[PDB]
Amino acid sequence: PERRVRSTLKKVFGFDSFKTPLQESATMAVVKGNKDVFVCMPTGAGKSLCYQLPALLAKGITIVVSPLIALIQDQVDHLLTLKVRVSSLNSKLSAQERKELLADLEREKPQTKILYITPEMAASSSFQPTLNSLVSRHLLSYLVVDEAHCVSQWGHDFRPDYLRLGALRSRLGHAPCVALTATATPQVQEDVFAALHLKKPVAIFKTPCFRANLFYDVQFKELISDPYGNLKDFCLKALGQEADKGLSGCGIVYCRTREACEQLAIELSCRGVNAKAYHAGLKASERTLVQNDWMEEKVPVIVATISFDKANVRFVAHWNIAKSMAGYYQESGRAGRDGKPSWCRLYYSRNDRDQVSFLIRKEVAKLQEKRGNKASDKATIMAFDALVTFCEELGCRHAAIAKYFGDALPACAKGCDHCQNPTAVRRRLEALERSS
Amino acid sequence: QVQLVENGGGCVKAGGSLRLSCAASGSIFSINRMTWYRQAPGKEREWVAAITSGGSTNYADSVKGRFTISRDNAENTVYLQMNSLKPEDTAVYYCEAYGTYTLAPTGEGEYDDYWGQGTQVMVS
Ligand SMILES: [Zn+2]
């Protein structure tokens, strides 16, 4: 019940209570073990526990499948510092160590109770008698597939062995399966469900990408008479809410063209708000110095350029639209990590959208020349189309983000451009259409 | 859960037409495919119509000419209109609603498939 999981959360993990109620529900669903569970949570949300704590409670050994050996080793070390009885059979062991591990596995009451195996070694010929003994023994209790998204062709990563993991799942049917992905799209979710032969009832536990204390709004650089003036007003307002409070935290401003990023930083500085370019081309010493002066409060706002974190971020303002809605959502995610309300601005532009679309098309053409990962190119084009629709579309911005990422529609009573002032959005899109 | 309800079942003479309705209640993010199954007395279930995402329609070579399937995703409703009905199609009709994906503002969801109770059609 609840008491057992709570005890585990404190004795072996150290946490007093679950970070979020959603993962509490997910972990209890896995513990019940009635049906296959698909948990999609961001990194640092504790998704690991959703397969780790149930395994700590599982009657028998849990087989975890991860793409790379290095990730398996990192998880093994994290489990070992907690003194948990974890093992790995990836052939990483020498001869004697492999013999000992096989001897513990083959005998009853296996000492290993969570085994990290790359799919190759699970489907390797030599390991088949061991797996047959495991199933016949009924030792396997959970069949976790970490980074399950690698099975889906439309995902950013592809794993050919995760396809045969579906047949593996078809074997050892008596045990449930837990599929985990850092981020999930409904199409990717469908691919995961189909390829892994999971049971038809699947418990999907997905974090709502919606964030109450985030304000989402979009403006069209053609409509606004002076874009830098709007950027300055936004920066001032977000940075300083009241005279007594004074400037707080720091802002972020993404931009694709570095030549434009330096210009934006210098223009902001000249207007009155200091900014530091932090463009990737800059030398390592200078980039470190900038990242530092931003961590301290000396620098008000930092221009991310291609690449970026701080506890409080007053605002994010994309001078240019992002390549993919996943990228834009991640970039805006660091907005307002603190409780206080923040803001997220997208200065969507037809010319910039055309430029980045052409760049995406050229990249897809190069990929096709490679003759591989065609589904990846299709997914990238689909994501860019989704982002441009998001900027164009009339309606609740949070709702469109939820539609793309597939989580439920959010009830943002406050903190959305459309909901609060639909007439303003109507007028703005009418002006944009007239301009175009 | 999702409550599928059939409607429009009627007894039409040979040559006439009648429409069937299949509305999916509950909160559904999307549906993979709604398929109208036809089952007669003393016979194996036979597949009649299928509507998938994007409006793709799959029929039976013989049954294709008579029936037409049309779905609305926003409404979550699929209509199977029967034209030039024949005395052979005297079977009960069901919906499959294969691959139903449901979710809540919290985050909990399900991906099970749900079946409608059924609608009857008799032909002179
Ligand atoms: Zn809204």
Author numbering:
A (entry chain A): 12 to 319, 324 to 451
B (entry chain K): 1 to 124
Text lifted from the article:
Here, we show that a generic and kinetically biased ‘Gembody’ (Gb) interface, previously discovered through trapping in crystallo, can also be trapped in solution by kinetically controlled side-chain-to-side-chain bond formation in a manner that leads to ready generation of complexes; these display ideally balanced interface flexibility and yet relative complex constraints, in turn allowing rapid cryo-EM structure determination, even of small targets. Ultimately, after a survey of in-solution covalent bond-forming methods exploring differing natural and unnatural amino acid residues, we found that Cu(II)-catalyzed oxidation at a pivotal C12 residue site (together with the presence of needed Gb ‘gem’ substitutions previously discovered through iterative X-ray-guided engineering) offered a route to direct and rapid, high-yielding formation of disulfide-linked homo Di-Gembody (homoDiGb) without side reactions (for example, off-site oxidation) to form a robust covalent interface. Furthermore, the success of DiGbs for high-resolution structural solution is enabled by their relatively small mass contribution to the imaged complex while increasing the maximum particle diameter for better particle alignment. In summary, our plug-and-play DiGb strategy improves cryo-EM resolvability and resolution of small proteins through constraint and increased particle size with a simple and robust workflow and can even enable simultaneous structure determination of two challenging targets in one dataset.
Strikingly, using sequential purification, we generated heteroDiGbs bound to two distinct targets. Moreover, when we locally refined each target separately, we found much-improved individual maps of 3.03 Å for RECQL5 and 2.99 Å for sfGFP. By contrast, heteroDiGbs constructed from NbEnhancer and the RECQL5 nanobody yielded high-resolution results. Further validating these methods, all of the structures obtained were largely consistent with deposited structures, with the only changes being small interdomain movements observed in RECQL5 and its slightly different Gb conformations.
